[PDB]
Structure formats: structure tokens, C-alpha cells
A paper describes a structure:
[name] has key roles in stem cell pluripotency, tumor suppression, oncogenesis and other important pathways. We used chemistry and cryo‐electron microscopy (cryo‐EM) to visualize stable mimics of the intermediates along [name]-linked Ub chain formation by the human E3, [name]. The structural data reveal a ≈ 620 kDa [name] dimer as the functional unit, comprising a scaffold with flexibly tethered Ub-associated (UBA) domains, and elaborately arranged [name] domains. Our data show how a full-length E3, ubiquitins to be adjoined, E2 and intermediary products guide a feed-forward [name] domain conformational cycle establishing a highly efficient, broadly targeting, [name]-linked Ub chain forging machine.
Thus, a stable mimic of the transition state (TS2) maintaining native distances between α-carbons of key residues was generated achieved by an electrophile installed between the C-terminus of a truncated UbD and a Cys replacement for [name] on UbA that was reacted with UBR5Dimer. An 8.3 Å resolution cryo-EM map of the resultant UBR5Dimer~UbD~UbA complex largely superimposed with the structure of UBR5Dimer~UbD. Local refinement yielded a 3.3 Å resolution map resolving elements defining the configuration for polyubiquitylation. In addition to UbD and UbA, the map also shows the UBA domain and additional density around the active site that was not visible in the other maps. The UBA domain binds UbA positioned with its residue 48 at the active site. With the [name] domain in the L-conformation, the UbD-linked catalytic Cys is situated not only adjacent to the acceptor but also at the junction with the N-lobe, which is thus also poised to contribute to Ub chain formation. An intermolecular hydrophobic core is formed among [name]’s F2732, L2762, L2789 and A2790 and UbD’s I36, P37, L71 and L73. F2798, in turn, secures the UBR5Dimer~UbD active site and inserts into the interface as a molecular glue affixing UbA. UbA’s [name] is guided into the active site by interactions with [name]’s LOL from the N-lobe, UbA binding site on the C-lobe and C-terminal tail, and by interactions with UbD. Among UbA’s lysines and the N-terminus, only residue 48 is fully buried by the catalytic assembly.
Residue numbers in the entry:
A (entry chain B): 2016 to 2075, 2215 to 2264, 2271 to 2312, 2501 to 2798
B (entry chain K): 1 to 75
C (entry chain I): 1 to 72
D (entry chain J): 180 to 226
Write the structure that this text describes.
């Protein structure tokens, strides 16, 4: 049609019923989608109105907890329906872990009827329940870094412009990289099916390809914000009072050059020549073809392999009526660690046998030390406790419902972690600096044992 | 005489060792150096585990040698 | 140096233990003081059953811990 | 058997014997074993 082609329209996942959506060109990024410029507002107790802005009035069924609870009973029904297991022997490094994971994940899943996966690294007497979480965060950080690929060699992800969000690169894709893209959605599928957390983070166009929903123009704001703004003022300048005194001197075309993560350069969008100039009356065709080529054309086979790998685990009926945001909440959790929620997930088991005001003064020191701690050390402490670098967003995320306990007082004993399910053991000391030094010395170790 | 103790964070403090002592003397030396009690300690080096029943000279270790200290604390 | 092995009803027996004790010595002491056969009971330490091969140090049962007992 | 007709003493004893699992575990214990605590705890320790 014109400017109102079905690419520039808000989908069902970002609108409210009976309200006219705003115009997608006259409003900046902060006042339209406040989740684009900063992504830390995704919380379990977060309203949808403060995530996608205020809708316009028409005269001028549930939320998170309904979806995730029904999804959790459907996953445990599917889990108890099957009774075939999977054992894993991994190596705590990057290259050996990646190679061993993709050679031991081909024997399985090649629908599927797995039940439970057990994890052991090597020479470690720590076979419990946190080994699966440790394996999931190990494969996530193995595929999350950018060094190389240890044969079967470009990296499998890049960062489109926001830190922490990862989008795949083809990199002259071949018969091995496509299989490595196929066997990475299965890890996310098992994380969804076993009710855990895996630290792999994707942009919403990657997820919306996997779920089976069409990608629109507003999903480009979560991809590249500065290019979104540049094309926004290009469209607004294309409908000025004159619009020909600035497009005759800009000298654009329908040809594209690409960066190192996409390939070469000088690719024609529409055929039969790159010599056409962009007159103002087909600027929307240029914007749509540019965005659609940047998402859905160069990354066609990695996204296709990821969707095939995701549907190789689960049947194609459970992901219906599931948005990308609660998809992120069931997998990535809350992201950063908030200490108030961590206070709300404790019990204070007492076994010290001391009457220093019947305890209840050592805990103020502990919480002051925890609240006066750095963010990386906070993730280190949470990984020290539950073998996971972030906390879930609900009571139902934890199977053992974690706890700390106080031991008989020894001044020389640094704190220990019974992390095979959830528990932390803390000896009692005197004063503050002793506890500070012992705990900040203890929480830098991630090696299991016992 | 001196050994090379290394950890994850990069701390390195020299130790004094007898040329013909035992492994428990090494563990006593490192607990006296810092204050890490040896019940949570373990020494793994050169692809093998060491038990305190054998001497430090039984395992063919020279002077200014290297050793990796692993804290068995979680489980 | 005390372990309270609480039963199902609520009674509590007394034990004197060592951190270096092996489960072979556990079978030795339960045939010494008690005489109950070892193929009729199971033990719980924080939701984790022990094994005859690993010692108490491999399962982190130090001084003054909590142990359970469930008959077969 | 309705879930509310049982006292909380049995579920508290099962919790302090076996911890780290769900309320549905005690539901399946009540629906199947018909109050045989040692056999049910041995079966849940057999998995």
C-alpha cells in the first residue's frame, strides 16, 4: 500500500484492546518503548503499561502468573509422561566442553521423549542437583564469549548495540555451523522443560522467530536504537514542506554494505541495478527492505536451524499464547540480583548454641555486608550459594527452597556451602571485620568438591 | 627451600619448606601463612593426587617448584 | 562430638563420632552396640543419602550435625 | 481422599525426612501408598 504496509503496525503482543495505538514516527524511543533504552524494568511485578508506553483512548486473559503456572504444570505433566534419561560427562573449560557437548547431544535427539539429565564433570565428588545448573551456565559462558570455534571458525554471536543481548552471525555458514546452531536451541528447550535458568540472552527477533510470530518494525528498536532513530528522522524529513531539497543532496540508493559479522558489501536490495536514487515517495519501501534484509535474509538458516532444534525437544502446542518477555522471565530470571528478594528466600536455621542476645545481632552484620557489596561479587555470592548466577522470579523456581544455617562458633572456619541442593553453612565469629574477610575470601571460589 | 603457591585471584606469598619433610608440614606451613585450615584444603598437582602418608620427597619435587592449591569447600 | 539420629517417632539415640570415620566402621559400630542388620535401614543427611564407599569427610558430616534414619 | 482431611503431622514428618521436593510428592504419596511411610520414603529414596 503506502506508509501503512503490514510491517509498520503493532502486533498483539504489544497492544491493549479497544485502544488506538500511537503513531510509530512522531514519538522518540524513550517515550514510546521504555524497555528499549533500558531493559532492567522487566520484573515479575511489572505492569504492561510502563513497559510499552501509554495507549491512546478509543473515545477521545491474564498476566504473567496465569501463563507461567499453567506452563509449569504442563511441563511437569510432559516430564512425568516420559521416563528416559540422559547422562553427561563434561570438562570445565571452553573448547573441550563445546566439542563434547555437541558430540554427546547428537546421540540423543537424533520428536524426543527425554525425562531427566544428570551431570558429572570429571574427578569431582559433587554429584547432586546443582551440577545441571553449573553445566547450563558453563555451556552458556562457553558459547557466550568471542574467541574462536574449536573446529568440527567464526564466533556464533555478536552484540547489535546493547550489552548482554546476542544475535547470531552466519559467517559463511556451512554443514557444521548449521548443526551447531541446531544444537543450541535444545539447551534452551531443556532449560524451559526442566524449570531452571540458563544464562543465554537473545534479542526479541530471535525469540519471535522461534515462537512462530511475524517480526514487525517495532522489534527493530530492540535491535539497533541509533539506526532506528536515523531512519525515524529520515521518514519525518521525507514528508516535510518540500522534501526534495534534502533528498536530491543526500544521494542514497537501494544498495547496502555490510560489516564483518555479515559478509562483504554492495548488495542490491531490489534487482536490475543499484543506480536508482531514493526519491521521497518510496522511502518506506527502502526502510522495510533494509530492515528485512538486515534481520531475516542474512540470518535465515541459523534461525531456521534454531527453530527446528527448539521444536525437536517440545511439541508445537505449548509455546502458544507465550510472549517474548515471559519467555525471558522463565529462562533468564530477574537478571541482576536484588538483595530484598534474597532476604525473602531465607530461613535462618540455628544450631550454634549461643546466647549472644539469642543470636539476632550477627544477622544485621551479614545483611549490611551483603548490601554493601559490588555487583560482580554479588553474582559470585549467588553462584556460590545456588550454583546459578541469577535468581528466579517466583517461589516455584526453587525445588529445595534455599536456606542458611549457623554452626557452633569457630573463629578459624570460613563459610562452607552445601550447594548440592541449596544450603549454606556459616560458622559464627566475633565482631565484623573477621566475618567480612572470611566471607569475601570464600566467595571467590567456584570449584565444588566434597 | 621456597615453593610457588598460586591461586585463582593471583595471590603469591613465599613459604619455607624443609627439603625432606612431609605433606602435612606443607599444609601446616600454608595454614600458618594465611589461616586456611587444612580440613578444607587439597593439593592437586601434575595430574595426580597426594596423600599425607607419603613424604614430600617421594613424589620427585625439586626446589623452587610449582604447586596448585584447590579449596574443597562446596558440595 | 555428638550426632543425633532422630527416628520417625521422636526418640533420639546417642553417638560418638569422628570426621575421619568410614562407613565400614559404621557397620562395625551398628553391629557392636545395636546389632541391627544393615540391609534394613537408610540414612538422611540434609536430603542426601550416604554411601558405603565414601567416608564422612566426602559427604561433609563434621562435629555436631543432624542425621536421620528410616527403616526399610 | 481429600487433601484437607489429613493432619499436618504426617506431611511435616515427611518434610523433615525428605526435603527438596514438592507438595505434589506428598499428594502422590497419599493417593498411592495408602499410609505406608517407610515403603513410600524408601521408594522416593529409590529414585
Amino acid at each position: 500500500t503506502g506508509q501503512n504496509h503490514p510491517f509498520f503496525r503493532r502486533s498483539d503482543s504489544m497492544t491493549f484492546l479497544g485502544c488506538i495505538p500511537p503513531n510509530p514516527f512522531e514519538v522518540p524511543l524513550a517515550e514510546a518503548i521504555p524497555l528499549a533504552d533500558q531493559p532492567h524494568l522487566l520484573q515479575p511485578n511489572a505492569r504492561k503499561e510502563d513497559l510499552f508506553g501509554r495507549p491512546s483512548q478509543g473515545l477521545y486473559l491474564g498476566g504473567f502468573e496465569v501463563k507461567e503456572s499453567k506452563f509449569r504444570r504442563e511441563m511437569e505433566k510432559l516430564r512425568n509422561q516420559q521416563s528416559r534419561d540422559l547422562s553427561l560427562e563434561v570438562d570445565r573449560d571452553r573448547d573441550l566442553l563445546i566439542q563434547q557437548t555437541m558430540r554427546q547431544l547428537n546421540n540423543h535427539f537424533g520428536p524426543m521423549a527425554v525425562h531427566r539429565v544428570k551431570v558429572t564433570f570429571k574427578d569431582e565428588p559433587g554429584e547432586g542437583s546443582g551440577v545441571a545448573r553449573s553445566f547450563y551456565t558453563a555451556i552458556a559462558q562457553a558459547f557466550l564469549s568471542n574467541e574462536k570455534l574449536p573446529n568440527l571458525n567464526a564466533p556464533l554471536f555478536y552484540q547489535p548495540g546493547k550489552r548482554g543481548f546476542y544475535t547470531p552471525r552466519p559467517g559463511k555458514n556451512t554443514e557444521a555451523r548449521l548443526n551447531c546452531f541446531r544444537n543450541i536451541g535444545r539447551i534452551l528447550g531443556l532449560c524451559l522443560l526442566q524449570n531452571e535458568l540458563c544464562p543465554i540472552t537473545l534479542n526479541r527477533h530471535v525469540i519471535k522467530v522461534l515462537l512462530g510470530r511475524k517480526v514487525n518494525w517495532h522489534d527493530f528498536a530492540f535491535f539497533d536504537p541509533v539506526m532506528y532513530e536515523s531512519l525515524r528522522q529520515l521518514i519525518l524529513a521525507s514528508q516535510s514542506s518540500d522534501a526534495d531539497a534534502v533528498f536530491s543532496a543526500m544521494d542514497l540508493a537501494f544498495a547496502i554494505d555490510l560489516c564483518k559479522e555479515e559478509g562483504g558489501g554492495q548488495v542490491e536490495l531490489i534487482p536490475n541495478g543499484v543506480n536508482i536514487p531514493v526519491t521521497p515517495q518510496n522511502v518506506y519501501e527502502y526502510v522495510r527492505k533494509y530492515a528485512e534484509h538486515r534481520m531475516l535474509v542474512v540470518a535465515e538458516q541459523p534461525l531456521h536451524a534454531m527453530r527446528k532444534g527448539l521444536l525437536d525437544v517440545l511439541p508445537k502446542n505449548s509455546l502458544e499464547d507465550l510472549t517474548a518477555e515471559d519467555f525471558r522471565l522463565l529462562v533468564n530470571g530477574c537478571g541482576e540480583v536484588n538483595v530484598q528478594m534474597l532476604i525473602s528466600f531465607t530461613s535462618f536455621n540455628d544450631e550454634s548454641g549461643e546466647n549472644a542476645e539469642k543470636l539476632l545481632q550477627f544477622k544485621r552484620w551479614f545483611w549490611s555486608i551483603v548490601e554493601k557489596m559490588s555487583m560482580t561479587e554479588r553474582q559470585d555470592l549467588v553462584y556460590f550459594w545456588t550454583s546459578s548466577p541469577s535468581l528466579p522470579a517466583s517461589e516455584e523456581g526453587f525445588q529445595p527452597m534455599p536456606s542458611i544455617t549457623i554452626r557452633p562458633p569457630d573463629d578459624q572456619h570460613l563459610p562452607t556451602a552445601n550447594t548440592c541442593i541449596s544450603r549454606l553453612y556459616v560458622p559464627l565469629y566475633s565482631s565484623k571485620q573477621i566475618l567480612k574477610q572470611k566471607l569475601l575470601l570464600a566467595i571467590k571460589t567456584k570449584n565444588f568438591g566434597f | 627451600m621456597q615453593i610457588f603457591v598460586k591461586t585463582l585471584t593471583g595471590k603469591t606469598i613465599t613459604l619455607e619448606v624443609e627439603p625432606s619433610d612431609t605433606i602435612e608440614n606443607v599444609k601446616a606451613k600454608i595454614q600458618d601463612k594465611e589461616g586456611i585450615p587444612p580440613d578444607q584444603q587439597r593439593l592437586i598437582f601434575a595430574g595426580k593426587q597426594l596423600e599425607d602418608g607419603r613424604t614430600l620427597s617421594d613424589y620427585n619435587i625439586q626446589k623452587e617448584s610449582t604447586l596448585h592449591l584447590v579449596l574443597r569447600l562446596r558440595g
